[PDB]
Amino acid sequence: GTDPRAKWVPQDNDIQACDYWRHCSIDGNICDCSGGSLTNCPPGTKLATASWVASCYNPTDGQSYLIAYRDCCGYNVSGRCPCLNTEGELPVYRPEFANDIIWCFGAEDDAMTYHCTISPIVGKAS
Amino acid sequence: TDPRAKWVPQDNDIQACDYWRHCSIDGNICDCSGGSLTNCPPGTKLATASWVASCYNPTDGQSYLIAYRDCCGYNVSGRCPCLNTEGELPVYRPEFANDIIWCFGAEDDAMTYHCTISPIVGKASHHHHHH
Amino acid sequence: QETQGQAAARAAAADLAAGQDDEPRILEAPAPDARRVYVNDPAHFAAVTQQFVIDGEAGRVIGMIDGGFLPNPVVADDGSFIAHASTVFSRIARGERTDYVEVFDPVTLLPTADIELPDAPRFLVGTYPWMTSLTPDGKTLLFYQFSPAPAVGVVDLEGKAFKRMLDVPDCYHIFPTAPDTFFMHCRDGSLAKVAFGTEGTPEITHTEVFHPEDEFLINHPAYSQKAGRLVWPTYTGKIHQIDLSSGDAKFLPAVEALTEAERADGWRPGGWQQVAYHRALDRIYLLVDQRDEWRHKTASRFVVVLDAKTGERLAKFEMGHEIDSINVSQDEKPLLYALSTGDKTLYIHDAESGEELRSVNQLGHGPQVITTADMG
Amino acid sequence: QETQGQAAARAAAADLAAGQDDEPRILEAPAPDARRVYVNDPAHFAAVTQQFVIDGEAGRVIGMIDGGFLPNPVVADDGSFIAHASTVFSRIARGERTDYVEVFDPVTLLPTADIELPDAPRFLVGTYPWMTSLTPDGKTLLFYQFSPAPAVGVVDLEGKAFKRMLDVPDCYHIFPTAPDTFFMHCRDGSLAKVAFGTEGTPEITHTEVFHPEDEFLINHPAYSQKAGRLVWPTYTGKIHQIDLSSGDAKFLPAVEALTEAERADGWRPGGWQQVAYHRALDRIYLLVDQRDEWRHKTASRFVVVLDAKTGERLAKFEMGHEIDSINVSQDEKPLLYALSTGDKTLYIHDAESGEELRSVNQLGHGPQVITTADMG
Amino acid sequence: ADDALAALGAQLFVDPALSRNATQSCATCHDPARAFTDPREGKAGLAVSVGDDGQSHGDRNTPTLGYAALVPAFHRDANGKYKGGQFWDGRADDLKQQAGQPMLNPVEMAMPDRAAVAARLRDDPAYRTGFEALFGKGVLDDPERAFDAAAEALAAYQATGEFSPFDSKYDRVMRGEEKFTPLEEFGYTVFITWNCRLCHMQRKQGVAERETFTNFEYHNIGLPVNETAREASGLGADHVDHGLLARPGIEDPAQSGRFKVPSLRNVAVTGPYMHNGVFTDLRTAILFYNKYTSRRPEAKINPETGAPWGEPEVARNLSLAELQSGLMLDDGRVDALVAFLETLTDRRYEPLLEESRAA
Amino acid sequence: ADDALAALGAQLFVDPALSRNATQSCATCHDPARAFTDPREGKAGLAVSVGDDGQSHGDRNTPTLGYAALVPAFHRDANGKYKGGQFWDGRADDLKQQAGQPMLNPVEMAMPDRAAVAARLRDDPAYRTGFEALFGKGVLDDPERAFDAAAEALAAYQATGEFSPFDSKYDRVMRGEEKFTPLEEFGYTVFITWNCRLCHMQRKQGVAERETFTNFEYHNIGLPVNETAREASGLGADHVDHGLLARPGIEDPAQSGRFKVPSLRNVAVTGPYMHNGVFTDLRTAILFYNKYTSRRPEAKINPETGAPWGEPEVARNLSLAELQSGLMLDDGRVDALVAFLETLTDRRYEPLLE
């Protein structure tokens, strides 16, 4: 398929694909693939309130957005639509941009197992 | 690699699913996660329960009873998985049935399935499955 | 044509453009309907496993349920809940064993009951749907115990408690016919009828022996609780149909899935869930293919469809993939679900024509069991 | 030549023909040695996981250890035990969380300790080896915590008890240098030295800032405890070396893994364990490939081998597979282990020539972490 | 008309003749040189404001009028969450409903009734001209119309660009005219990845066109009573400020102790903080959030008093799910947030930043 | 050598002149018509035998001599398990060391000493000739050489094909000469898949050339005392049969209550069962194993008595790892097991199967 080392090319036409522009720093599985959606958690799982950010280029409007990702927690890993992108991803000592961390904090019932990640926008980037 | 074809036993590689003794094996050959043909890997617990099958041995054309035994108390090895069903009968003939987790008698009440050994315990036939 | 992912990209791009705000939250799954399908992944004996809840119409995963070691899923025909008998260990696959039943709300997927089973009494085996069963009124769960002897466990889902074990003879599988009654299949070739009062031993009656010693009946019969129809293929495709609707076992005329000819050219059923039964259509579906007599657990590429009443073949479908398990929705114009363990993919077919409509890939590690609610 | 399964078939045939008897039993793994290699499989965030204990010389799996959610494995350098900090939940991935440490006998693989950690204190993160660490004497296991604030947990392996949490600055990773001392790397670009007692505010000291805010130091630096050498690449294959063998941090000269022409042609490190350090040889092994700058976790197909003192390149190996992690045996004529998360295969190479020697496949779902004991 | 109406409100806004003893105009408490808040000292410092009678103190801190015009009218959304309104407890629907209230409040401007208010407007020839031109002849003779017209004028003036200029560094940075300092940028990244963003951002997702750093909801963050202010106001040692529950028509006991999330625009210059003015320093308000997250003893100590924060005035309906984020702000992230919130200061108040720590 | 020696042993085996009163021979208790066990009714039924004095009863059941010559000589193997030897407690090393003991045992044949034995050998001109030809002139005038020579003749005699003919139906089936009945084959299957194969097979794996349905180990299976046999033995109600621990040399407490795994050959016709004859029916002996696995009330009841089995004579060193198999033998498997065991009957005792 893709040359994995090639520069990531965003698209704005399929949210289940690993090159969907909002997933530029996703790590894990797309929630849309296990019964969530782009910005919602699947039934039974618990929404984290922690997030990490990236500035993701949206080739639809030429604008870069801040995507503050959020984990859906308390389920085993969905195993569907796995992806790992790291645009602007910084190491763990810049946790506000670091994406190996299980960002499940604040999830209800202290859920801390990783199920999938959602990609909501929270601002415009500069 | 034709999964439906009659199974062609070989006596040259115990880690392959067509090894002659694995003729009614179900799970994982122990020899792939640190056991051997007839020994359990470390950390696992050898069950006393068995299921049996008369497996044909290409080499000497003799038929041998293999009393499969489970090594238990570990998550499934994930290595050299195999499923053969020579002579295998349904669960109401449990002695020949191989979906059953035959972990009974394992130390510490271990009942999780890790892999299966294939030792010989007899040179005999069955009515339902003779050569 | 437009995929669910594409349509989603478009609605997101639209919300963005219109400046439409939405609260990130926990979705509810769409109400259970007849086209909902559950795929259980026993994961080739992995210590934890997954159940996939799938909208069969959209071919979309609408939810998931985590399970332990070889759990037995059950689905209430009326769609009001799901449950499983499961097994965990305090150190992944080692240490203290806990068997338990969970009952789940079928839209929030939240567990509504977690009932401990004393003395780790579950039968640990490659998943046989009919090794754990709901009584028709959904108030009781019965599970099989093999060790130290065949027994059946009675779990009250209403009082959310385990009651006791029933001592049965040398028999297998559990097909509930009533709040207090289930049949089992016996080594002597009979069925045992088990009626349990609140206390006492149960009363156990035997049918006549209905098959010789060298006729092998598969571990995955179809049973329609609402039809009382136990459909039981044997290795040759000979199919026993037993009617348990009267409360007692009526034996239907024995039927043949493959022609005497076909059987001569090496046609035999094979797979896991080799048979499905559609209640309203009174129709038997059978995974078969050409195979050696002892390759009975292998994937099959073809499905035969036959009238339960007569044995007439209605269709023969080249499935187009290696299929291990089939089942059907119980609605009119059913889906035929063809699950490939090897592909970890549910292929969703039109049951009338056998054409492939859509599919759901990435269903775990070795998915095997398909359940559907019979909601009609 | 003769594969291991062929050798075994021959030997069993000979035992059969010879009437040789033998008791079926539980094997001991062979004695830990320099070519033992552990591969941990975080399984892409699965709730349960596996470690494969591998004889690197034979390329044979000699054993396995089960774990929970994103366990941190450690291997005592002297071969006396292995351990991990692990996390389970009462209902697979839901319910009551128990963090705990197991210590295991390295030949029976039996756990000889199971130490609960109170208040579920482990950092749940894609596996970084240096987020949980053994002190040099093997007596204490230190584990990082992120929530609610950066912190470090002290576990007494010898008394088989958890001790306490230490409060640290905004810092990351744990490199022990002594029974009571470790370094961390801080957000501000310094190292923090943490000297701790049984009770008391730890003694926390910072080195000077040793890199600008825009040089990014990777999550998988190689640390040789016996050498006190912390080998820390940046995104560009710039390598920071820090010498902590005096007990305080001395900054070694920066070396470039890649040439300027290579860097101008897009060469950069990438993978998971991107760097290995051979103690006796004082050699750095870096996984590199041509890649965009933000593709830094993708596999690489090349290893550069450079002298750590001079930064002279000694080799550029063409690995021949998509390698995510490397590591080396710490003996003479070391093996270069090259783990493909994608292939789930440990390729085992002659570290001198780079030639592939053998491989071990079927190592779980998403294996990422190679650990060797430095026993010399 | 929309210029003239606003301009008539600009006149009323600064007119002390709308208070009983003629000492007090809106501008007295909502002082334009202080981002429309009250610089004056009272019995409880700057926590609460003193009325026209020279004696009466309110029980809540005087909030800025800056950006107040961006708040939606009060309403319950579909998720059953109350949003918008004016006053800390949302008991006014909108600016126009709020405006006449200080006028008749014996603790504030203390006019006895609408007629006393109309009588004042009638005394001033420019008002007769200004009002009559906008509302018609004889408007001032009808105390109901005069009062409502004044409320409308006052609402309109508060809706002008002068109250919401969006000319903060943050605004300038979001235009691309300039950049944040590194501290500000880190502050900003924290603010939007941490729990603040769950309440202090207009939207749950996507981008706001005129961000004012509040979602207009009601949350009980578990603040204690401000003792000096509560003494000063005289409401009683047993009095409970119920927040939103005090809005008439709200009966739901789950609303007790919930207050309107303030806009963070000009937060840097409008101390002290919270609905009761309880914390003097911007840093302190931010530090309060660590009490739900940190496991350090100091997390529980108000740094301004060296004593525990205090029992919540209302212990129930705490926004725990949002507040118990599991992550504590270290002092680096606290400094960052201060610097970031300083960027929310309007251009004309930037010189005020100087004194307050730094800028 | 072999031929004549065994023929000498055949003479001695049936000679009552080797008992004090001249009333008993090996044959009396080891009756060739009863698979070399004791048909004679005593105080304790057939549980124990009566010595030459017509009053002294043993404390253990007389085992078959059939197949005893297949047992290895007593030894500790490398895993630390004791194996082989003769007697239920292994106290004799082999058949030769065992042969002399009944002769001089006062509760059995009761000769006073090797000398009185030799005197008796001397009264018989035929012994004079038979012994002299194999062991040399004057052998019988030396009581030591006389007694050893006798014992050796007996041992040789027990090693002839006549004691171990391998002509049972089981042997014929394993030669492909005959088939097992369904029930028998079910039996064999159950026997080799359930815990039985763990003690009653020669080998752990591989095929045994001369299977005798015993691994020659020692196990405490947890049997109670046989009240009446113990009564008749006169050893006292205080007495504890410590089994293998009673062999001289064995000091290891873990061996207490352990007995040699009997060969199951001819089992169907050498009732009653176990070291003490406590169970008269073979079905019972098999049911006893359910006490460790079954949870059903009946599994704790000996079906011969209607009463609880009894606490073990030795409630220590039970082989629990083997006996607690987690699986219960239903009626069917017990039937099948009985069926299978009956196939281990030598051809010549096939008529006895009643």
Ligand code: HEC
């Ligand atoms: C001091 C005695 C004041 C004078 C004179 C005026 N205001 Fe005021 N204002 C004051 C307080 C103590 C409060 C909060 C009281 C509460 O119950 O919450 C207010 C509030 C407002 C608001 C709402 C702002 C918001 O909720 O964010 C507005 C729009 C407002 N005040 C405007 C206003 C006008 C138009 C005035 C002259 C008529 C005026 N205020 C006088 C303190 C005082």
Ligand code: HEC
């Ligand atoms: C809802 C759960 C909130 C979260 C999370 C945060 N804030 Fe907040 N903030 C909130 C309310 C309801 C209020 C008013 C409370 C009252 O009763 O008075 C506040 C107030 C502030 C202030 C003072 C502003 C002023 O007085 O004008 C500041 C400086 C503030 N909040 C900052 C802030 C930060 C930095 C947060 C993340 C750590 C944060 N808040 C979270 C509602 C909520």
Ligand code: HEC
């Ligand atoms: C009844 C009074 C007996 C006479 C006469 C003989 N034997 Fe015997 N034998 C008898 C008993 C009660 C026992 C078991 C005693 C014990 O302590 O366990 C035995 C045992 C043997 C054995 C061992 C068989 C085995 O362990 O499997 C042998 C080989 C044996 N006996 C041989 C034997 C010979 C050669 C005799 C004539 C000299 C003889 N027995 C007489 C009962 C009696």
Ligand code: HEC
């Ligand atoms: C080792 C733990 C054993 C297992 C498992 C089985 N048997 Fe056994 N058997 C064993 C011993 C040590 C003995 C003698 C015990 C004593 O002290 O007397 C026995 C005895 C029998 C007998 C009696 C034979 C005779 O008296 O000559 C029978 C019929 C028997 N055993 C059969 C049997 C079956 C069918 C089993 C599986 C259900 C079985 N045994 C298990 C040793 C062990």
Ligand SMILES: [Ca+2]
């Ligand atoms: Ca204020």
Ligand SMILES: [Ca+2]
């Ligand atoms: Ca006997």
Ligand code: NA
């Ligand atoms: Na105060």
Ligand code: NA
């Ligand atoms: Na109210």
Ligand code: NA
């Ligand atoms: Na002794």
